[PDB]
Scaffold this active site. Structure first.
Site, short mmCIF file in Angstrom:
data_model
loop_
_atom_site.label_atom_id
_atom_site.label_comp_id
_atom_site.label_asym_id
_atom_site.label_seq_id
_atom_site.Cartn_x
_atom_site.Cartn_y
_atom_site.Cartn_z
N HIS A 60 0.84 -1.20 0.00
CA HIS A 60 0.00 0.00 0.00
C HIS A 60 0.87 1.24 0.00
CE1 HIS A 60 -3.46 -2.64 0.59
NE2 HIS A 60 -2.87 -3.17 1.63
N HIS B 202 5.67 6.68 6.85
CA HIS B 202 5.36 6.37 5.51
C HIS B 202 4.78 7.58 4.85
CE1 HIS B 202 1.62 5.84 7.68
NE2 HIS B 202 1.03 6.38 6.60
N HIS C 244 2.09 9.12 1.49
CA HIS C 244 1.01 9.01 0.51
C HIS C 244 1.37 9.93 -0.61
CE1 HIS C 244 -1.67 6.94 3.52
NE2 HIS C 244 -0.87 7.67 4.34
N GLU D 134 -3.28 13.55 1.66
CA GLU D 134 -4.65 13.10 2.24
C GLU D 134 -5.38 14.32 2.85
OE1 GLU D 134 -3.55 9.35 4.55
OE2 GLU D 134 -4.48 8.62 2.69
N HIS E 123 3.53 10.74 7.10
CA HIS E 123 2.91 10.41 8.39
C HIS E 123 3.94 9.75 9.29
CE1 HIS E 123 -1.29 10.29 6.34
NE2 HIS E 123 -0.89 11.56 6.70
N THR F 45 -6.05 6.42 8.26
CA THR F 45 -6.57 6.72 6.95
C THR F 45 -6.52 5.48 6.03
OG1 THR F 45 -4.42 7.39 5.99
CG2 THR F 45 -5.85 9.19 7.08
N1 LIG Z 1 -1.84 6.50 7.34
S1 LIG Z 1 -2.11 6.27 8.98
O1 LIG Z 1 -0.88 7.12 9.46
O2 LIG Z 1 -3.30 7.14 9.29
C1 LIG Z 1 -2.13 4.50 9.44
C2 LIG Z 1 -3.20 3.65 9.07
F1 LIG Z 1 -4.23 4.16 8.33
C3 LIG Z 1 -3.21 2.30 9.46
F2 LIG Z 1 -4.27 1.47 9.11
C4 LIG Z 1 -2.15 1.74 10.20
S2 LIG Z 1 -2.38 -0.01 10.66
O3 LIG Z 1 -2.26 -0.83 9.34
O4 LIG Z 1 -1.06 -0.47 11.33
C5 LIG Z 1 -3.67 -0.65 11.77
C6 LIG Z 1 -3.64 -2.16 12.00
O5 LIG Z 1 -3.83 -2.46 13.35
C7 LIG Z 1 -1.04 2.55 10.60
N2 LIG Z 1 0.02 1.95 11.33
C8 LIG Z 1 1.36 1.64 10.85
C9 LIG Z 1 1.99 0.30 11.16
C10 LIG Z 1 1.77 -0.81 10.30
C11 LIG Z 1 2.34 -2.07 10.55
C12 LIG Z 1 3.17 -2.24 11.68
C13 LIG Z 1 3.41 -1.14 12.52
C14 LIG Z 1 2.82 0.13 12.28
C15 LIG Z 1 -1.06 3.91 10.18
F3 LIG Z 1 -0.06 4.75 10.45
ZN LIG Z 2 -0.65 7.46 6.36
#
Ligand SMILES: NS(=O)(=O)c1c(F)c(F)c(S(=O)(=O)CCO)c(NCc2ccccc2)c1F
Ligand SMILES: [Zn+2]
Length: 257
Positions: free
Chosen positions: A61, A91, A93, A103, A116, A195
């Site tokens: 993603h 990460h 977008h 976003e 982010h 998001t």
């Molecule tokens: N873009 S965001 O900053 O708002 C966001 C998400 F939308 C999101 F779904 C996640 S998620 O996939 O981890 C939620 C699952 O429980 C993270 N987190 C970043 C992350 C991913 C894998 C391992 C550690 C942190 C995340 F940071």
């Molecule tokens: Zn993000």
């Protein structure tokens, strides 16, 4: 199943993740005129001097730069926060064109990309527990515009070709996230969500007013990544942003002006 296309993009998410139509979804448009100045909001404290990056990963993603969050090494506090929040990963977008990609928007303006930096509240002991809490995350959002190069970004851009496809990963040590910060820490802040699915309503968003500038060649390298895995048909990783969601019953607060 979820992703960013005609058939599994943001407009489809609510079928697997009904909270997509929830009361505090992100991102949002930041209407700079109607953001409330709160002279009681404190300066943001970003303490990244002891950060330890570990790996960089293509998760299909976006790409994540992961950190060791097993001690208080890289932490966000102050600002609108009561707790101490540990950096776990950052990460981005971005778009298919320089005119889109962020976003959050500012007076409906889209930026080319959005960084982010994801942090979790230490009172909850780990990320997986924190996302289940209404005050579990603090995400620092930074806009990218295309102009001069950001030299502190180039170590990230130079490794992307080693993690071209979904599931690839590479060691990524001694990366300093201070190199990605603009000069001012003035911010907007509001309660929202992740998001991407699972879209959980666990985030205190802190969005910096000042964008960083990256070069066209730096953002072009992000667009050479792939959403597909190795040996599957090539689909460029572009436009992995969710559009603005309704503000509903929320007020965005400003630390400045
Ligand atoms: N873009 S965001 O900053 O708002 C966001 C998400 F939308 C999101 F779904 C996640 S998620 O996939 O981890 C939620 C699952 O429980 C993270 N987190 C970043 C992350 C991913 C894998 C391992 C550690 C942190 C995340 F940071
Ligand atoms: Zn993000």
């Amino acid at each position: 199943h979820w992703g960013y296309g005609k058939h599994n993009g943001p407009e489809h998410w609510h079928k697997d993740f009904p909270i997509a139509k929830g009361e505090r979804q992100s991102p949002v448009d930041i209407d700079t005129h109607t953001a409330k100045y709160d002279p009681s909001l404190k300066p943001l404290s970003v303490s990244y001097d002891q950060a330890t990056s570990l790996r960089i990963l293509n998760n299909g993603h976006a790409f994540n730069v992961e950190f060791d969050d097993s001690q208080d090494k890289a932490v966000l506090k102050g600002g609108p926060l009561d707790g101490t929040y540990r950096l776990i990963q950052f990460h981005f977008h971005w778009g298919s064109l320089d005119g889109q990609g962020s976003e959050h928007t500012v007076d409906k303006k889209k930026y080319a990309a959005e960084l982010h930096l994801v942090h979790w509240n230490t009172k909850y002991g780990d990320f997986g527990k924190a996302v289940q809490q209404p005050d579990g995350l603090a995400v620092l959002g930074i806009f990218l515009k295309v102009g001069s190069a950001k030299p502190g970004l180039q170590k990230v851009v130079d490794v992307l070709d080693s993690i071209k496809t979904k599931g690839k990963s590479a060691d990524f040590t001694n990366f300093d996230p201070r190199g990605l910060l603009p000069e001012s820490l003035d911010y907007w802040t509001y309660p929202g969500s992740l998001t991407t699915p699972p879209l959980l309503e666990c985030v205190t968003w802190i969005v910096l007013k000042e964008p960083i500038s990256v070069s066209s060649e730096q953002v072009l390298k992000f667009r050479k990544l792939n959403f597909n895995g190795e040996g599957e048909p090539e689909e460029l990783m572009v436009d992995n942003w969710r559009p603005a969601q309704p503000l509903k019953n929320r007020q965005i607060k400003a630390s400045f002006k």
